[PDB]
Amino acid sequence: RANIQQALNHITKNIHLTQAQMEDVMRSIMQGEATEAQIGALMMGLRMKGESIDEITAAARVMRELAIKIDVSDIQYLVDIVGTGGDNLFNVSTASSFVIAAAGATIAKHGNRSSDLLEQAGINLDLDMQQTERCIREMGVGFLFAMKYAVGPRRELGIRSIFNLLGPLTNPAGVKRFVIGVFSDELCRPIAEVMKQLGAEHVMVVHSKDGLDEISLASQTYIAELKNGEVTEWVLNPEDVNIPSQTLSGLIVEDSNASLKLIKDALGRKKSDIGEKAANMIALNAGAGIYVSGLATSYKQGVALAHDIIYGGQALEKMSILSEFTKALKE
Amino acid sequence: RANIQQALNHITKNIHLTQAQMEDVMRSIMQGEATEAQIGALMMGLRMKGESIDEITAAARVMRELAIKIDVSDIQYLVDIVGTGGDNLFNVSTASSFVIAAAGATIAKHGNRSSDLLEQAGINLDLDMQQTERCIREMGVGFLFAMKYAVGPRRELGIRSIFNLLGPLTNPAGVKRFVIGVFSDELCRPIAEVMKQLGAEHVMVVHSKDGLDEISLASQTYIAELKNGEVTEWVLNPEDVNIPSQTLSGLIVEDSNASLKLIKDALGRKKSDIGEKAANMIALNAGAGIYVSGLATSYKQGVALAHDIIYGGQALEKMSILSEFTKALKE
Ligand SMILES: Nc1ccccc1C(=O)O
Numbered sequence: 001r002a003n004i005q006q007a008l009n010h011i012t013k014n015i016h017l018t019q020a021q022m023e024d025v026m027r028s029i030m031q032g033e034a035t036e037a038q039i040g041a042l043m044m045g046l047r048m049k050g051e052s053i054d055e056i057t058a059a060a061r062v063m064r065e066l067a068i069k070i071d072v073s074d075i076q077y078l079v080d081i082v083g084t085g086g087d088n089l090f091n092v093s094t095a096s097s098f099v100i101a102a103a104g105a106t107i108a109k110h111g112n113r114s115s116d117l118l119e120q121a122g123i124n125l126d127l128d129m130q131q132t133e134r135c136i137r138e139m140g141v142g143f144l145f146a147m148k149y150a151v152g153p154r155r156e157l158g159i160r161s162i163f164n165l166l167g168p169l170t171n172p173a174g175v176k177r178f179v180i181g182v183f184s185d186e187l188c189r190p191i192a193e194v195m196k197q198l199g200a201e202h203v204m205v206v207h208s209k210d211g212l213d214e215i216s217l218a219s220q221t222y223i224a225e226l227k228n229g230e231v232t233e234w235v236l237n238p239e240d241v242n243i244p245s246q247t248l249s250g251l252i253v254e255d256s257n258a259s260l261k262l263i264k265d266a267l268g269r270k271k272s273d274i275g276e277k278a279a280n281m282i283a284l285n286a287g288a289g290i291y292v293s294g295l296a297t298s299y300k301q302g303v304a305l306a307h308d309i310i311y312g313g314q315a316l317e318k319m320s321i322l323s324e325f326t327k328a329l330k331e
Numbered sequence: 332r333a334n335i336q337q338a339l340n341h342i343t344k345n346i347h348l349t350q351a352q353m354e355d356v357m358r359s360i361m362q363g364e365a366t367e368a369q370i371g372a373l374m375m376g377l378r379m380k381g382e383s384i385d386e387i388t389a390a391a392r393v394m395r396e397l398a399i400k401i402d403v404s405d406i407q408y409l410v411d412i413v414g415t416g417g418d419n420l421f422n423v424s425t426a427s428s429f430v431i432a433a434a435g436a437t438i439a440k441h442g443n444r445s446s447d448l449l450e451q452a453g454i455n456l457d458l459d460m461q462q463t464e465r466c467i468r469e470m471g472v473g474f475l476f477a478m479k480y481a482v483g484p485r486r487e488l489g490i491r492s493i494f495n496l497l498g499p500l501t502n503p504a505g506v507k508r509f510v511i512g513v514f515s516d517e518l519c520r521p522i523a524e525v526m527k528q529l530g531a532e533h534v535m536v537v538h539s540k541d542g543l544d545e546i547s548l549a550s551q552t553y554i555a556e557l558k559n560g561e562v563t564e565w566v567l568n569p570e571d572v573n574i575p576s577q578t579l580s581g582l583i584v585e586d587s588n589a590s591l592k593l594i595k596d597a598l599g600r601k602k603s604d605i606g607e608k609a610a611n612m613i614a615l616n617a618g619a620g621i622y623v624s625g626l627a628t629s630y631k632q633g634v635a636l637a638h639d640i641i642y643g644g645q646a647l648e649k650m651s652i653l654s655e656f657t658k659a660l661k662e
């Protein structure tokens with residue numbers, strides 16, 4: 001109790017916690033030793049101070065230990081595409097996952113139980129870890145879904161918090177290459193530095209000017225990139241990779257069925273006008289994944305390859321093939 | 332729920348709540364409609380943003396409505412001496428209360444259930460509102476003790492918060508003249524402005540450089556003063572009123588009995604060296620009360636009168652007389 005109260009005191013004085021201190025705190029929360037009021041206070045306080053690199057890294061190490069894991073790190077072109085949650089677009093990252101797989105890379109996608117969409121798409125998620133790893137290894141795409149004590153405070157507060165940050169940072173499959181979306185420009189560099197410390201090889205950390213935790217079709221996107229042990233920052237426009245920047249109109253959906261309908265349009269051979277808009281936003285994001293997986297040697301090249309897959313229809317077939325596979329696994 | 336989540340969102344963007352918004356929030360908390368996590372978040376977030384004048388005033392109005400009240404505002408030289416809690420000194424304000432009464436002013440002291448000390452001093456606090464008002468009216472001194480839903484979150488977080496600020500601001504007896512201690516220099520002016528808006532006549536809001544929510548014997552004290560409808564800020568040294576500034580050594584106590592022992596020394600005719608130190612700190616604080624009550628026309632004059640009472644022993648007799656009275660009331 002004293003440790004948490006002490007942590008809260010420092011935070012009000014804008015004093016960052018040490019790795020040691022954050023580790024103890026996150027352990028307590030995970031072990032159920034922190035009160036709901038204390039969890040709410042920690043989330044709010046850390047968010048307003050700004051979570052430091054050490055705070056986030058220490059929290060991530062604690063959560064990773066307490067996760068059921070697999071290890072598919074032997075696979076070449078292994079990548080995860082994952083966001084904190086931003087500021088109701090269709091499921092771009094899930095759509096991108098199939099493009100990435102169809103391109104010849106492998107995605108082990110860490111998700112938050114998207115889940116409804118896959119189910120709508122005839123993809124059985126009632127799968128254990130062993131069955132998920134089979135999807136990853138044999139189909140080039142699997143979906144990883146899962147602490148307990150944070151779920152209530154998170155829904156009640158409704159804010160973006162360190163627990164959002166920790167989602168991307170706790171892939172349980174041994175993935176080392178990532179496209180990570182975050183909910184502010186100032187979190188891009190820090191999260192890249194965290195991923196470095198957790199052993200990552202290549203990551204793009206992104207946040208668009210229009211407030212998305214992904215690369216936007218409508219605005220510029222701020223990038224922090226970890227590559228070859230170093231972190232750089234740069235800015236992206238769709239035009240930089242021969243894609244026109246368009247408004248997000250028609251890309252906001254009401255429910256899971258509308259999202260799947262738009263995605264199948266966007267990934268199919270005969271695209272509508274809004275389908276072509278969706279296809280282009282997917283190309284920008286799937287492109288980042290193809291690039292950081294190592295399969296393409298630049299972002300531009302990755303986007304090109306993505307574009308080829310999206311307009312050729314192969315990603316839509318990868319969807320269908322995964323559906324048949326999962327249904328086969330369940331029998 | 333949405334209102335609280337919206338409030339929390341604004342607070343993370345350092346956007347102050349409106350009076351209307353804070354009123355709804357505080358109502359929900361008071362009505363039990365806010366979750367513990369949400370209360371913890373609100374306390375932390377408001378503290379780190381800085382509670383605004385409107386936020387504090389609106390919160391105070393809501394709490395005042397939900398209080399059992401009396402009205403002793405007809406009494407001349409009516410004052411309350413009260414603090415937020417600061418950064419373990421003996422009970423200076425309780426000691427000061429008896430000096431203030433013995434000087435001919437009347438104190439209706441809002442306290443937080445100090446309580447143990449009075450009980451140790453043979454003062455029966457098992458009194459209803461009617462019996463307390465009798466103490467105030469007939470003895471010149473009574474002690475007012477009491478929401479439910481904040482007590483847990485407050486103890487768990489351990490931080491100073493808006494609920495500390497609200498204690499001084501919710502006297503239930505109709506008092507209009509105050510010495511209020513706060514836990515930082517930057518809260519002095521704001522709280523004075525709040526008290527103005529709540530209808531106060533004369534208040535000194537104080538915080539010492541050494542971190543006390545009272546006037547220190549050891550350091551300078553920052554003052555924000557509401558007088559004649561206007562707020563001014565000034566700084567105080569003990570020397571300004573012919574009292575030597577001494578360290579707080581010997582004034583920190585371990586328990587209630589040690590506090591009462593020191594107080595009776597400090598208020599008695601034959602004082603020890605530490606008793607004289609305590610007497611002087613009480614003179615500085617009781618002096619402020621005599622001044623803002625209207626009984627003295629300046630702070631310096633108030634301190635002089637306080638000093639006379641403290642060294643003459645009359646405050647110690649006021650203690651004994653209140654003790655006999657309360658014991659008589661209970662029979
Ligand atoms: N944003 C996430 C991404 C992946 C897994 C969990 C989360 C989460 O918010 O809890």
Ligand SMILES: Nc1ccccc1C(=O)O
Nearest residue numbers: 414415442443495498499
């Ligand atoms: N500081 C106070 C002063 C008077 C009454 C209550 C309080 C309180 O903190 O709740």
